[PDB]
Structure formats: C-alpha cells, structure tokens
C-alpha cells in the first residue's frame, strides 16, 4: 500500500466523474439512482494466485506424451534406414 498512490487514485476518481459531468449522457446515467435503506452487501476475503501444483502435473503428462512421440518418430526413422 502507498498513501500517495492511493490519493492519486482518489484524484483520478474525480476526473472520471468530471467526464460524466461534461456530457448530457452522464447526467442521465445518474437519474436512476434512488435513496432507500435497503442494501445487498457482500464483504468477504478472496484468494489470489496459484503456482507449482498445476505446473508439476501439467509438466508430467505432456513430457510423457512427447516421449511417446519421439519413440514413434525414432522407429519410423530407424525403419527407413532398414529400407536403404
């Protein structure tokens, strides 16, 4: 977290509000907003990122699949030597 980097965000938050205020369509967008005491909130933690487990599995299966390819290409290469 950076306080100056946040404050910029709040300064830049006002710029996008100013973009709406300049145009007539920005005013009509805000027309539907009402005032009531009924809200549907959802405040909860959320996980981020994942590295190593999917990799190890997705390195095991293709390496074997490739190795089977080499074995097939080798026997095809070796059989062409027999036809010489």
């Amino acid at each position: 977290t950076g306080l100056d980097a946040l404050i910029s965000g709040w300064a830049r938050v006002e710029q996008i509000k100013a973009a709406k205020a300049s145009t007539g369509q920005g005013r009509v967008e805000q027309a539907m907003t009402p005032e009531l005491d009924n809200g549907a909130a959802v405040v909860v933690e959320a996980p981020k990122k994942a590295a190593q487990p999917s990799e190890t599995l997705v390195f095991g299966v293709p390496q074997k699949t490739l190795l089977l390819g080499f074995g097939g290409l080798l026997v095809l290469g070796l059989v062409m030597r027999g036809n010489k």
Binding site: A11, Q30, T33, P34, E35, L36
Partner: protein
Amino acid sequence: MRSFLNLNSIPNVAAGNSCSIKLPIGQTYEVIDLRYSGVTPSQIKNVRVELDGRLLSTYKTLNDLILENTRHKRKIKAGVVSFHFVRPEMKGVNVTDLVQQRMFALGTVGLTTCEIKFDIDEAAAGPKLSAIAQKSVGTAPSWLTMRRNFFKQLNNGTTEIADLPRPVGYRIAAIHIKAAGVDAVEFQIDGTKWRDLLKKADNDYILEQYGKAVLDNTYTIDFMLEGDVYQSVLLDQMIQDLRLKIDSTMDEQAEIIVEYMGVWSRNGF
C-alpha cells in the same frame, strides 16, 4: 450536475429526545445544511456521524461544528449549520483543486447505513430541525475527515500529551487544544521539533496569515495551512513518538480535537 434535496422530516424532534438524520444510501453527500430553531447549537449535544454503525466524526455540541466552519472562514448564518464533507479550502498539488476538495465528500456506495445522531437538550425551548442535502453522483465513502474527541488535564506549567491515537496509514490535518490558559505549544515526532515552542500570538498570526479565523480559548495546530493534504501528519507505523508540549497558565481540563484523515474502512479507525 448536482442535486439539492429537502431531506425527509426528522423523526421525533422534541426536548430531551434522541434524534437521528438517517441518510439514504446510493449517492454522495457533499454538504448537509441543518436548519434549527427553538434550540441553541449548544443544546444539540453528542453529535455523531456514523457509517454502518461505526463512528466517523463526533461533536460534543452542534456549536463545535459552527466553530469548525468559522475557523475556515466559511459562510456562517444564524439558524443554520452545515456539515461540510467536501473541504472547500483544499488545493491540488498533482490534481485540480476541485478534485482535492470533492475527495472529502461523503460517498455512501457500499454502505448499509449513514446516520447523523444527536441528543436534544431538555431545556430546549421548542426544537425545530430540518435538513437539506447537496448531493452528487455516488462514490464509496473513501477519503473522509474523522473528527475525534479527547479530554486531558492541564497543569499550570508544562503538560505533555503523547498518548494520541496513531491509526496506521491515517493522517492528521489539525489539532485543536480547547483551553483558556494555553500560552505556547510545541509539536514533535520522534524527537524532531516540527513546531517549535510557538507563543499563542505567533501561532495565531500564522493561522490568520492563511485566511483562518482564530477560535476563542483554542490553540490550533493546522497542518494543512496551504490546503495541501500532503503537508498533514502521516501516521507512519515506524513512528515511535507523537508528542505535544503545552505551556499553560491554568490548571484545567482541555478538550483536544484531532482531525484525522484516511480511507474509510469497515474495520478501520
């Protein structure tokens, strides 16, 4: 375009009653004009601005809000007192002045409740209160001013106050020492003397020098005299000492007003 609305009627406005100004969630409240009659500002006690049940700002009496506005030389009118969420004195450094001022507006997006509670004194002649709202497009609570109240005893000689809350990431716009016998004050952080032992007359001269009005029986330490938010005290975690050295001439209990600032949080200050 802004919208000026006549807020819903305040329920049960009577002497000795505990009323509240419940604000509808959805938009942003820049200013709230509270009209009063049949009661004095001092008769409107324990004013609290609450977001989701949590305290944001507190005023011992409505008169403190009148003094808050008077200090910045804002328009004062008898029979009306405004809640200036948007700070008109703000000046931008890397953004426009307008952006820096509006950034303090009371956004309600994501909020469950927005209230302005207060108690009407029993001596109130015939209390009559109404409110008008100057609103704008909805925004999260975000950057807000958090007025906090503290009571400390002062001696006749030197008094030091170093136990002021230091919420991490937050800032301090100003500190108001409400006492009648304060001669000089000194402010320091980690030994560093940011404010020398300045005599009241000298401190008050600098205040007025920046378009501010000196409040009676108050020693104001304005950290945003230029209107620059980045001149305010940044409550950095590594801070080990936030001290105030008060030179008084009387033995009394002072009301220390601290204007905090920071991004409002469901689980913050």
